[PDB]
Amino acid sequence: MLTIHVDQDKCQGHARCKALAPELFDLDDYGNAHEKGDGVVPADLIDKAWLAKSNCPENAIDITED
């Protein structure tokens, strides 16, 4: 059981998360990312989740595990 969170404070709109996991993130008009509706990570996107997290230069992405 995974969900994804973007910390707006840390986020500087690099947009790596979006490029890697389009299904998981949306950017606002100003370039910042935020989790898509559900937030829950589908089984086929679990690797892209950790990948986006690993890839954020600002360490702005959080993944919770239950």
Ligand code: F3S
């Ligand atoms: S800085 Fe922001 S746009 Fe994505 S890659 Fe990191 S959360």
